[PDB]
């Protein structure tokens, strides 16, 4: 019949934090030329030469090197969870603070029948038979192509 505990404010520590993160892009350096790995990462890569580019609506973009690319079932699907290593980057994720910038990507499989999920697959699906009917499954980024 009571709820008695303590707290503390307790001056907090100072770290680096990304607040207005409007969008998050992934680039690579495989063939010596940088390109946009917008989707379809497949199996997580063996070597971590990627670097995450976070574009913000408040201030300019930030480039940070990747640390760990793994696969985690968000709802029983191939969702790539990627973490970012910075000297002190704290990400207010789900009302709690994590010591690394971690974010999830989207998709995996390509819809040969009808590119309803991604551009890299849409441009391939349309070129097969232009006539017919097509629908989009979600907003699709054309950076992929």
Distance CA 83, CA 67 (A): 6
Q: What is the 3-state secondary structure (H, E, C) of the chain?
A: CCCCCCCCCCCCCCCEECCCCCEEEEEECCCCCCEECCCCCCCCCCCCCCEEEEECCCCCCEEEEEEEEEECCCCCCCCEEEEECCCCEEEEECCEEECCEEEECCCCCCCCCCCCCCHHHHHHHHHHCCCCCCCCCCCCCCCCC
Task: List the resolution, Å.
Answer: 4.0
Method used experimentally:
cryo-EM
């Amino acid at each position: 019949g009571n709820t008695t505990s303590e707290n503390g404010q307790t001056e907090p520590e100072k770290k680096l934090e990304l607040r207005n993160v409007s969008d998050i892009e992934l680039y690579s350096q495989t063939n010596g030329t940088y390109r946009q790995h917008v989707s379809l990462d497949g199996i997580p890569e063996n070597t971590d030469t990627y670097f995450v580019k976070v574009k913000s609506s408040a201030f300019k973009d930030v480039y940070i090197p990747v640390a760990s690319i793994t696969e985690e079932k968000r709802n029983g699907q191939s969702v790539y969870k990627i973490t970012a290593k910075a000297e002190k980057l704290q990400q207010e994720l789900e009302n709690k603070y994590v010591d690394n910038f971690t974010f999830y990507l989207d998709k995996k499989a390509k819809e040969e029948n009808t590119n309803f999920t991604s551009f890299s697959n849409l441009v391939k699906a349309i070129n097969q038979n232009p006539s017919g009917t097509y629908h989009l499954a979600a907003s699709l980024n054309a950076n992929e192509v």
